[PDB]
Amino acid sequence: AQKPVDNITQIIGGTPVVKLRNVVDDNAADVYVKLEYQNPGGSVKDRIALAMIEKAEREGKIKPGDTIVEPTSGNTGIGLAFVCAAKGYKAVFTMPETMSQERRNLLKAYGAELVLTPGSEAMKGAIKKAKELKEEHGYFEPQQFENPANPEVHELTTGPELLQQFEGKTIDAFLAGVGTGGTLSGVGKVLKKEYPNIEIVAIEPEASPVLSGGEPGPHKLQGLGAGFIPGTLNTEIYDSIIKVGNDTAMEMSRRVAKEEGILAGISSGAAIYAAIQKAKELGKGKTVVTVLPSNGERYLSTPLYS
Amino acid sequence: QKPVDNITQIIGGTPVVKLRNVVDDNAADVYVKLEYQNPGGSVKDRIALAMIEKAEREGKIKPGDTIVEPTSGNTGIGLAFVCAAKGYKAVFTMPETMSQERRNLLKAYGAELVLTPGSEAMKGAIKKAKELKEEHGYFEPQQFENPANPEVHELTTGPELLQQFEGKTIDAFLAGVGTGGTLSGVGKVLKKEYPNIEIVAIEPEASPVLSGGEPGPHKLQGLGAGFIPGTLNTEIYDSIIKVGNDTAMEMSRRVAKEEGILAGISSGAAIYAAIQKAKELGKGKTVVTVLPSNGERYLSTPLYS
Amino acid sequence: MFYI
Amino acid sequence: MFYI
């Protein structure tokens, strides 16, 4: 049990790793899974929310009481709202009016202000409104898709944690779904430095396989498939790309929940599906690691568990 | 932490956070133990694993057997989570009032649901589980009687707090009473190490059964069973703090906005009572309470609606 | 009714 | 439309 801290953000990081024992064949490599949903805010985005805020503090760009704006309808909104409440910043999020009342109440419960943009404009209108508040009113925009603090925090916390957790062993393959790409790039840089023969595998939805030179599209793998190549993604870090479909990811999340007791989001089901295929390719004696970015409870209102 | 072989090995060792803004510095320090950091999302993770493990070790069940429990709250989630992780079939009885989202959560772990008339509340669910057990040999953990419930807090939760507050004295420990396992197990351990500690039970003002009041409907989910459970040591606590529905809800909202700590309504009750005890104890003292669940599990409730 |  |  960790000794008491004075701020909830001091709990971010240090997430556990669980070996999969049922859904992976015995004739395959070991599959280990890092529970980023054990972060206090509920997802991997806890790390980059705190890092982007504390980097701007360090650089003198913001001070407690300042207002932060970010166009997000996913876990970065929850992570930023959580961190801003904990550190004393005013969080503002732009999002289409379409968003669910549950997610809106969650962000408002942290005291965040919501700027609701036209639902017909979707993410474009939300990004537009954030730019107006940034440019015309001086709101600080973390910009999770360009801010180097995103992949760098994975260089300085997530990656090193995996080194410390797999000391005495070698990691033969790391896989991660790509949303901002900060996870894959930051930990991939650190693991490749320590394990020069590791395979770094990008996971992306088969509906929007942009990284595989493919063509953008709509998917249900929340947290992935931004439709572009983010500045925070190091496109050289990965040696290969595994594409996962919506139904395959949902079926794997349900199996992991029923057979491993690990209830995680659809993107986690995609990561585990890819990690199992890679583990079957490597065979016994090899070690395959992937990341579970979010919990399944956050999606009990989705067809994933309906 | 080094990799573990099963998700149940993550249960326990939950962190503690000091409150900075909802409590003034002219009062005692208030620390909260985040039991929602358990992998299944609540304090019930501990007793679900302990009851399954004890029966397992006793030979009453082996993997493949079915577990039955009358539960509408976090014990069902904890049992479904532990059963899925350890290879047990789970059946839960519940009134028709339970939300579809909670039904989907239990089904996601592979549990089976047996619905009882909603107007009968938990009374009907309890009776259905008894029939299922006594006629089919299903194991019922029985969270309100099973000694493994207060014992796991005796063996883990309590020693964790002694571990975390080493070099210091806990002047008051407070916990909301559902089954009473937390207060009884932790209070026993803390009183042994801190003989002058003040152990305070927390119960709903609208259903103050421990104070000798009449049971009644309340909104402090996880608390107020309407009866005195066998798993509650009714002598462990030195006082009782009753908390109303509005007070608990407003404190939960304040803690989320001002501390960044999003917890359930029973955690708002616990933090409110701990702050009152901290004002009473004054600066220099140490108050510790427990937050049993996360606020994200109650987004469809008026707590954050 | 209780939720425990 | 994405959710990141």
Automatic annotation (TrEMBL), chain B:
Q: Which UniProt keywords apply?
A: Amino-acid biosynthesis, Cysteine biosynthesis, Pyridoxal phosphate, Transferase
Q: What GO biological process terms are annotated to this protein in UniProt?
A: cysteine biosynthetic process from serine
| Stretches assigned to the Tryptophan synthase beta chain-like PALP domain | 7-292
UniProt-annotated binding residues for pyridoxal 5'-phosphate: N74, G178, T179, G180, G181, T182, S266
The EC number(s) given in the record are 2.5.1.47
The reaction(s) this protein catalyses = O-acetyl-L-serine + hydrogen sulfide = L-cysteine + acetate
N6-(pyridoxal phosphate)lysine modification sites? Answer: K44
Q: Which organism is it from?
A: Staphylococcus aureus (strain NCTC 8325 / PS 47)
Q: What is this protein called?
A: Cysteine synthase
What GO CC annotations are associated with the protein?
A: cytoplasm
Question: Which cofactors does the annotated protein need, by name?
Answer: pyridoxal 5'-phosphate
Main enzyme class: transferase
